[PDB]
RNA sequence: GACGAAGACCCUAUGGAGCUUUAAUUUAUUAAUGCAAAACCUGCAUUAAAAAUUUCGGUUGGGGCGACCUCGGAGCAGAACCCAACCUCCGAGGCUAAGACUUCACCAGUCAAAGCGAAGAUCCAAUAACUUGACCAACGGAACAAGUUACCCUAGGGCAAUCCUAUUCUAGAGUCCAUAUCAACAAUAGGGUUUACUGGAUCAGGACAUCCCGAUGGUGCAGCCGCUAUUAAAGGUUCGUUUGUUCAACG
RNA sequence: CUAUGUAGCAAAAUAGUGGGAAGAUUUAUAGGUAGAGGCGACAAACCUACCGAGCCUGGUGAUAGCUGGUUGUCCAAGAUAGAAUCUUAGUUCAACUUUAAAUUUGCCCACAGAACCAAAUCCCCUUGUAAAUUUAACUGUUAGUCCAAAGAGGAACAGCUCUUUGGACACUAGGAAAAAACCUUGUAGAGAGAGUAAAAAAUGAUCCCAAACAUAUAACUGAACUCCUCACACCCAAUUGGACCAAUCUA
């Protein structure tokens, strides 16, 4: 089945490469990390992968999460893991095309 | 309970694909995509499969 | 199961009782280790055969020199039970481009010139 | 004693030869009919008998009986990946395109930025077609083949949960009293339990955990004998009726 | 029916004891039935010594996932993931191995990092190293045993089936008595040199089983490990690469 990380921290991942294959949401998508229908995480932008811990604010459109956050004491928060890809190359450059 | 039926179009004929329909339901017609002209056309069933 | 062993760092902490028991000193440590193998690689896991093959310790006693830097100590902490480490001693300094061919290593670990 | 120099028994082979069939395929040959052919033979079809060719999946209590055979989810497999089970518990049968993942092969399988447009295999048959289905569930699938070989042949392989017994607390008894006797449970010891879902004659060697003979202690034997206990293996340890998993009964 | 005989006088006899012996008897002579056939007072009995299917020649060098074999010298690399299969006595793919060739990173590895519901593992900067990937081309092995450990099954046992991490064996040598699996040790030759490694016990059934020793200073002994003088390709199975070559014929 092999539902685990496939690009670990500090790895150079190109566009479209799968970062993590999972069953439940162990690792939530972050910056430049997209999700598929099967919860696979894939790298949208070429770069370097990092993992972080952040605050969780679910979609109100979702129901199984918008209510549990409604059951938490003052000063509470649901922290969760995220996997980002800091992009490496810039979008583009400008080069002389015509001298007229 | 359900039957696969070869649905065919009317304008830009020749299309065929086996779609599903509940057997308890009567003859089926839909508005969907014909790529010969790439337009919305009425597709109707011809023969159950 | 049987697994690699991660030695807690607490053991590698010389005490005030150990320092006067061997000829060492906390401050101003020693440049080079002279290391010899006194045990067989056979009958031991492969992650020690490879380490020994990497430190040049393939042959038996046959002393060999290595830096005293943590990148090598991490390797010697895995094979510390198949080797004897002594500190090289230079009571006459590094040899010059003359006296390279007239050196000698005594059993106490001192490198000297012209026997 | 040199496992001293024919014959059996168990298992295997996509070996062989059979037998029976309500196992699969056939009617070529015969016999009936039926239809055309010029009172008989020729051709076609249907029905039957008679045969002919052919096969006997896999894991397994103890081989058989009986289940299951593909895919999926939970512990083993505590924390990247993978890891068995007839181990442990349950169900299912729009087009184009950078990059990647994978059920440890392959075959299959899986995700997907941007961009353009709309919101259970192969082969076969029917097919103009756009493509299409059942079986293949023994679920990597012979297109269609069962029961059985006590007449078989060849190539080959072949430190016990539950318990039995003795010593420990005596605690329960024994007309009074644990020690004259059983001594319940347990504990400490030495020893086995394979079926369900090999004797006799002949000669015997040996141990003692002793049946007798020998020596000793206590006795509730007041005494021979009895009872238990220690010691003792030099010697001995019957003849018959019925019957042969080998014992048992009886004189 | 018994005894002899069992390479015997004989590939079924001898000696005795027995059944029939005017009948469904026994027998000489010529002919007939021919192998999926004959014949059979059915026993799978007999058809020229061996018939659940004669014998000979041919197809035939039948086929054989099975058994057995496989021939000069020397050197070198060289071993136990797995999947499918009328498949587990075999094959194909992978993994591992070998050779030739191309290229540049491979292994070890701290800090950082991998979830909500104990051992460790994964990943890389450095560092010690010199290997690794890729391409071309083939064969061979494959579901091994024991020991330490963590689990599942059988007690937490039955020396029990299975999964996983490691070691060893199938390679050398020395020890524990003999000793594949424990401990010590590897790269190979000559030496009538040397230093070491491991390594000694405490307080039921043929016939016990080294002999002995309480008190003279702890060191010594002990390998193919290492050093020494010289020389070096000269200690694995299956497989793979290489250097030589006996004898015969020909130019
Ligand atoms: Mg077979
Ligand atoms: Mg057969
Ligand atoms: Mg599972
Ligand atoms: Mg599997
Ligand atoms: Mg795959
Ligand atoms: Mg798009
Ligand atoms: Mg099958
Ligand atoms: Mg299968
Ligand atoms: Mg042959
Ligand atoms: Mg086979
Ligand atoms: Mg070699
Ligand atoms: Mg790294
Ligand atoms: Mg040597």
- Contact present, B3 and B48 (Cβ < 8 Å): yes
Q: How far is the CA of A41 from the centre of ligand 5 (A)?
A: 21
The whole-number Å distance from C39's CA to E212's C1' is 38
Q: How far is the CA of C2 from the centre of ligand 4 (A)?
A: 24
> Is beta strand C83-87 parallel, antiparallel or unpaired with respect to C32-37?
antiparallel
Counting as contact any 3 or more CB pairs under 8 A, the partners of B are: none
- Contact present, A23 and A3 (Cβ < 8 Å): yes
Under DSSP, the state recorded for C1 is -
Quoted resolution (Å): 2.9
**Max CA pair span of chain B:** 34
C 23-82, residues with C-beta < 7 Å of strand E: 38-47, 50-51, 53-56, 59-62, 66-67, 69-72, 74-75
> Is beta strand A28-29 parallel, antiparallel or unpaired with respect to A79-87?
parallel
Q: How many CB atoms are located within 10 Å of the residue B19 CB? A: 15
Cα C13 to Cα C18, C19, C25, C74, C81, distances in angstroms: 9, 10, 13, 15, 18
d(CA C109, CA C86): 7
- Contact present, C63 and C105 (Cβ < 8 Å): yes
- Contact present, A45 and A86 (Cβ < 8 Å): no
The whole-number Å distance from A57's CA to E64's C1' is 75
Domain count for chain A:
1
Domain count for chain C:
1
Q: Which of A21, A26, A93, A22 is nearest to A53 (CA)?
A: A26
A 13-72, residues with C-beta < 7 Å of strand E: 23-24, 26-27, 51, 53
Instruction: Find the residue closest to E198 using CA and C1' atoms.
Output: C39
Q: Quick one: A31 exposed, middle or buried, by C-beta within 10 A (0-12, 13-18, 19+)? A: middle
Q: How far is the CA of C2 from the centre of ligand 10 (A)?
A: 39
d(CA C115, CA C106): 9
- Contact present, B40 and B29 (Cβ < 8 Å): no
- Contact present, B7 and B44 (Cβ < 8 Å): yes
The whole-number Å distance from B20's CA to E114's C1' is 45
d(CA C86, CA C75): 16
d(CA B27, CA B37): 25
Domain that holds residue A75: 1-100
Domain that holds residue C29: 1-115
Q: For residue A15, report the phi and psi dihedrals to the nearest 5 degrees.
A: -70, 135
- Residues C51-77 as b/e (b if ≥16 CB within 10 A, e otherwise) read bbeebebeeeeebbebeeeeeebebbb
- Contact present, A12 and A50 (Cβ < 8 Å): no
């Amino acid at each position: 089945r092999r539902q685990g990380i496939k690009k670990m921290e500090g790895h150079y991942v190109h566009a479209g490469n799968i970062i993590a294959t999972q069953r439940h949401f162990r690792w939530h998508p972050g910056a430049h990390v997209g999700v598929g229908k099967n919860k696979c995480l894939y790298a949208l932008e070429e770069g370097i992968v990092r993992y972080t811990k952040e605050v969780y604010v679910p979609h109100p459109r979702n129901t199984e999460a918008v209510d549990l956050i409604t059951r938490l004491p003052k000063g509470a928060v649901l922290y969760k893991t995220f996997v980002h890809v800091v992009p490496a190359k810039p979008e583009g450059t400008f080069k002389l095309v015509a001298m007229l | 309970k359900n039957i696969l039926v070869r649905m065919v179009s009317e304008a830009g004929t020749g299309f065929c694909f086996n779609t599903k329909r509940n057997r308890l339901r009567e003859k089926l017609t839909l508005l969907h995509y014909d790529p010969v002209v790439k337009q919305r056309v009425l597709f109707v069933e011809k023969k159950k499969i | 199961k049987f697994t690699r062993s991660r030695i807690p760092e607490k053991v590698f902490q010389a005490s005030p009782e150990d320092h006067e028991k061997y000829g060492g000193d906390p401050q101003n440590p020693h440049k080079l280790h002279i290391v010899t193998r006194i045990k067989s690689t056979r009958r031991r896991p492969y992650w020690e055969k490879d380490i020994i093959k990497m430190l040049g310790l393939e042959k038996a006693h046959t002393p060999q020199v290595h830096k005293n830097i943590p990148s090598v100590n991490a390797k010697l902490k895995v094979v510390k039970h198949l080797i004897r480490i002594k500190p090289l001693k230079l009571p006459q300094g590094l040899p010059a481009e003359e006296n390279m061919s007239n050196t000698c290593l005594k059993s106490t670990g001192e490198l000297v010139v012209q026997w």
